[PDB]
């Protein structure tokens, strides 16, 4: 099979044999007129029109200039609904950063247009101002939430977003809004900590009985959303469906689309062969482990993970990369990491404990510009200059014979073991 | 003896003897606290505060990337006195571009900041949307007026602004947020018609007669403005006065200020010597003629004008420089120019008719850059290197004894007999 893969701002063109291949496991009206649809056809509640009829101190979260949102759709038909019953609502408008830092305004142009950042009212969340957040409960793990004052203070709160599959929240989108979105940072990193992270339900496409998901949801609710709209985006970024309503339903209803669309069935293999979804999705070695998971789950116990990763920005963090810089196997990272408490959660830890659950059971093969060959190495990885020596010495790892999963776009799917 | 006249971004020096010398005309706690001052106590009408309990629409009407209002300052506490009694008020600020084209967001991140434009609504006017102007009236003169759409719906209309000597409408400020501010294109350009600019009434810090002031204090009226803040800022653009309340008699309390400080009185000479102001004023020659009119003011009908002015930009606008190099003298541009009726003003006219009327009776020597000698003499003017190469060409004009007057700033004076 001539089989394409993403990588950097270009794909590879690897030419493998087919009687080499188990699988190859991939994926399977104008965008304003699917958002419409999906706010007129609410999921579980009354429509935000009527929602919003008499409040008068709305905000809608938003998602940050780092997260593909195409708001400047979204935007303006959201608050058109909001003003269909009440024309002269005080809306904000609430980026919602999670731990990153503060959008800037050139960010917030490029995002939402000139003339809806002038225009409307938009505040930039600070997971690090004290002064700003509020305490609100307690969440079923035990842990404090604090979020967002003005999320709190809101007559009606609401969220727009999107929804892909997330290698330990399950999907994106929905209750994210609240936490990580606009939580405070300790309460950001508390939800990433490493009894969470071991939980055999953190993985990709799963929310029942995952308790990441879970604590999200309770904040939700604590945080009274009361609406989202929330899109499925192509690669280019494009609308193809959109949900709207109950902040749990609509979401839910989202989820099941996408687990259709992304869920590949794998029989696992001794070799596996695949990417990070192309520039800017594998920029760097922190964003690969994702890919990378999409492999684990389709490879047999010992086998070999060849991921095509650029990595055009390196490691991607420097807590992240010295987590195996200091350690001297994977396993001695895992338990370190394992070693932390919920409160004792540090920024990168979650990502360096995913690897190192792999790297426990598997080999990777990382295919990825020259500049990374020592982090890969340093992270008891192997790097590759191509596809056709990873696989080389994958074989030998393994069998010259070995059938091998192929799945071109390891971070847009959900691998679920047949 | 030694001047100093503002050039671009720095001032010249120059040495006068004083035998030559008619006059030297020129002009004469906290920022927060004088604005805070000002709102708490209103000329004219309640405090703010009051005006805006219980109004669920509110726009505040601010200046656009033209003019130097310190927003940063204004706007907060504008912001903070209409919500004391009123939390959930809705306010949007509109940006009076009158003519202009629109400001840009980078302009209105250097004005305002970044979080206040972020944070609050802030609208754009376009004069050229016709679809958000509203017919309200028609004014004293007989035109129709027409303005923003926003400003009409609003439940309570004020405007920031400052006050300075204005070269045709006699101060800046109050009223004047409403026409041109936010006015259709059609009634800006008929509010600049040649008969209201002929008229001897449109000159700096005159407003009594002048019709100009006129119909825009009508359609103000018409358009509902409430409240003013008027900030009266020195050569820094820091706040050293400020005046709130009723649209019209704060405003008047205001220029009456401005009068004081501003006002120098000259006897006519035959040589005047001045500037632009310096940067960002004396940016093209479009705008050199604001300055020029004090010159105007102080001269002899038949002397010599010599203005500094930069012009970095050149002319300032094509419109404009196309009626003198269109035209045979500046007699001919004033005659096409009062040729044409309320209804057929054209893009940028007025600088050109006022232009020509000084012109007319004066000569007038630019000293500029180097880039625009072909701009100057395309329109009737001598261009000069430095000030000493003009007060030459002066002197070969008139007498080489001639009495000269000297206004350093141009753009900052009242002009009296
Ligand atoms: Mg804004």
Same mark, same amino acid.
């Given at each position: 099979?001539?089989?394409?893969?993403?990588?950097?701002?270009?794909?590879?063109?690897?030419?493998?044999?087919?009687?080499?291949?188990?699988?190859?496991?991939?994926?399977?009206?104008?965008?304003?007129?699917?958002?419409?649809?999906?706010?007129?056809?609410?999921?579980?509640?009354?429509?935000?029109?009527?929602?919003?009829?008499?409040?008068?101190?709305?905000?809608?979260?938003?998602?940050?200039?780092?997260?593909?949102?195409?708001?400047?759709?979204?935007?303006?038909?959201?608050?058109?609904?909001?003003?269909?019953?009440?024309?002269?609502?005080?809306?904000?408008?609430?980026?919602?950063?999670?731990?990153?830092?503060?959008?800037?305004?050139?960010?917030?142009?490029?995002?939402?247009?000139?003339?809806?950042?002038?225009?409307?009212?938009?505040?930039?969340?600070?997971?690090?101002?004290?002064?700003?957040?509020?305490?609100?409960?307690?969440?079923?793990?035990?842990?404090?939430?604090?979020?967002?004052?003005? #999320?709190? %203070? /809101?007559?009606?709160?609401?969220?727009?977003?999107? $929804?892909?599959?997330?290698?330990? =929240?399950?999907?994106? &989108? @929905?209750?994210?809004?609240?936490?990580?979105?606009?939580?405070?940072?300790?309460?950001?990193?508390?939800?990433?900590?490493?009894?969470?992270?071991?939980?055999?339900?953190?993985?990709?496409?799963?929310?029942?009985?995952?308790?990441?998901?879970?604590?999200?949801?309770?904040?939700?609710?604590?945080?009274?959303?009361?609406?989202?709209?929330?899109?499925?985006?192509?690669?280019?970024?494009?609308?193809?469906?959109?949900?709207?309503?109950?902040?749990?339903?609509?979401?839910?209803?989202?989820?099941?689309?996408?687990?259709?669309?992304?869920?590949?069935?794998?029989?696992?293999?001794?070799?596996?062969?695949?990417?990070?979804?192309?520039?800017?999705?594998?920029?760097?070695?922190?964003?690969?482990?994702?890919?990378?998971? #999409?492999? %684990? /789950?389709?490879?047999?116990?010992?086998?070999?993970? $060849?991921?095509?990763?650029?990595? =055009?920005?390196?490691? &991607? @963090?420097?807590?992240?990369?010295?987590?195996?810089?200091?350690?001297?196997?994977?396993?001695?990272?895992?338990?370190?990491?394992?070693?932390?408490?919920?409160?004792?959660?540090?920024?990168?830890?979650?990502?360096?404990?995913?690897?190192?659950?792999?790297?426990?059971?598997?080999?990777?093969?990382?295919?990825?510009?020259?500049?990374?060959?020592?982090?890969?190495?340093?992270?008891?990885?192997?790097?590759?200059?191509?596809?056709?020596?990873?696989?080389?010495?994958?074989?030998?790892?393994?069998?010259?014979?070995?059938?091998?999963?192929?799945?071109?776009?390891?971070?847009?799917?959900?691998?679920?073991?047949?």
């Amino acid at each position: 099979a001539n089989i394409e893969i993403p990588y950097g701002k270009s794909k590879l063109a690897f030419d493998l044999p087919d009687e080499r291949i188990q699988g190859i496991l991939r994926s399977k009206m104008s965008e304003e007129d699917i958002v419409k649809r999906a706010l007129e056809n609410p999921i579980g509640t009354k429509r935000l029109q009527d929602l919003a009829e008499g409040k008068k101190n709305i905000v809608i979260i938003t998602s940050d200039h780092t997260r593909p949102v195409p708001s400047r759709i979204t935007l303006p038909l959201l608050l058109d609904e909001i003003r269909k019953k009440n024309k002269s609502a005080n809306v904000k408008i609430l980026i919602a950063t999670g731990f990153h830092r503060g959008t800037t305004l050139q960010e917030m142009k490029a995002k939402f247009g000139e003339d809806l950042v002038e225009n409307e009212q938009f505040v930039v969340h600070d997971s690090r101002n004290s002064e700003n957040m509020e305490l609100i409960g307690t969440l079923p793990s035990g842990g404090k939430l604090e979020i967002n004052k003005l #999320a709190v %203070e /809101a007559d009606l709160l609401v969220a727009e977003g999107f $929804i892909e599959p997330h290698f330990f =929240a399950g999907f994106s &989108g @929905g209750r994210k809004s609240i936490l990580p979105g606009i939580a405070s940072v300790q309460c950001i990193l508390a939800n990433h900590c490493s009894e969470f992270i071991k939980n055999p339900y953190a993985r990709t496409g799963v929310l029942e009985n995952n308790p990441i998901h879970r604590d999200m949801i309770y904040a939700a609710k604590k945080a009274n959303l009361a609406f989202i709209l929330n899109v499925v985006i192509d690669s280019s970024h494009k609308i193809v469906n959109a949900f709207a309503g109950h902040s749990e339903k609509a979401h839910l209803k989202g989820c099941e689309f996408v687990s259709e669309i992304a869920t590949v069935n794998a029989k696992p293999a001794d070799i596996v062969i695949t990417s990070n979804g192309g520039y800017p999705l594998d920029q760097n070695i922190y964003q690969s482990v994702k890919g990378m998971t #999409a492999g %684990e /789950a389709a490879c047999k116990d010992g086998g070999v993970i $060849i991921i095509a990763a650029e990595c =055009a920005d390196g490691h &991607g @963090g420097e807590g992240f990369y010295r987590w195996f810089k200091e350690s001297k196997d994977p396993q001695d990272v895992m338990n370190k990491i394992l070693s932390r408490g919920r409160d004792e959660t540090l920024p990168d830890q979650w990502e360096a404990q995913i690897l190192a659950r792999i790297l426990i059971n598997h080999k990777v093969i990382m295919v990825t510009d020259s500049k990374n060959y020592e982090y890969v190495k340093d992270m008891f990885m192997t790097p590759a200059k191509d596809l056709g020596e990873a696989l080389k010495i994958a074989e030998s790892i393994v069998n010259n014979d070995s059938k091998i999963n192929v799945i071109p776009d390891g971070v847009s799917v959900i691998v679920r073991e047949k």
